[PDB]
């Protein structure tokens, strides 16, 4: 129930709106909340959810990362969200459902996945 409280006054950046960036690999997910002109208001990870290994890169581990980060940024004072996506990695939808469950609208699921003009030769991996 309601309490008889003194005035509330604190600032961090009082942003009201943001962008998120999700850099999705095969081993992990990186989810990072930013300011609209583009500056960090917080991050989380699926390794910083402390699953370790391959288990950091599943829909269920993408989910809880998205939720880790979304809680803290309420102190930066954000209320609405947009997302930038960059990768072929797992957690395609299940990371978005969790951003939506922090009470934010997510109308824009924007792919910016950078395609170099056939960049640097990748690690050979197996000898076949």
């Amino acid at each position: 129930a309601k309490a008889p409280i003194r005035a509330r006054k604190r600032v961090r950046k009082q942003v009201s709106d943001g962008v998120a960036h999700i850099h999705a690999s095969f081993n992990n997910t990186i989810v990072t909340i930013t300011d609209r002109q583009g500056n960090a208001l917080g991050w989380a990870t699926a390794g910083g959810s402390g699953f370790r290994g391959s288990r950091k890169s599943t829909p269920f581990a993408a989910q809880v990362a998205a939720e880790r980060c979304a809680d803290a940024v309420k102190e930066y004072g954000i209320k609405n969200l947009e997302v930038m996506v960059k990768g072929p990695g797992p957690g395609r939808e299940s990371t978005i459902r969790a951003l939506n469950a922090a009470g934010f609208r997510i109308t824009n699921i924007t792919d910016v996945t950078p395609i170099p003009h056939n960049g640097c030769r990748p690690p050979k991996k197996r000898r076949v």
């Binding site: 072929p88 951003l99 699921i109 996945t113 395609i115 990748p122 050979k124």
Partner: protein
Amino acid sequence: PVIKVRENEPFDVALRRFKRSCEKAGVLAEVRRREFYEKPTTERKRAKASAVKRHAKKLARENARRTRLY
């Protein structure tokens, strides 16, 4: 490859099929392997090979009737 193209009426689940038209293919598909220059010319070019199944399939419909499986 959630794909930039926006799905009719926005939702938390991307309608990834209906978004994509030719994306990921060639561009973000050959992950973490040694890139060759000319290999596609003999490796990939199987258009001739798929044209045979499409003729064969158009032949066999008439023939199942002629056998009376139909």
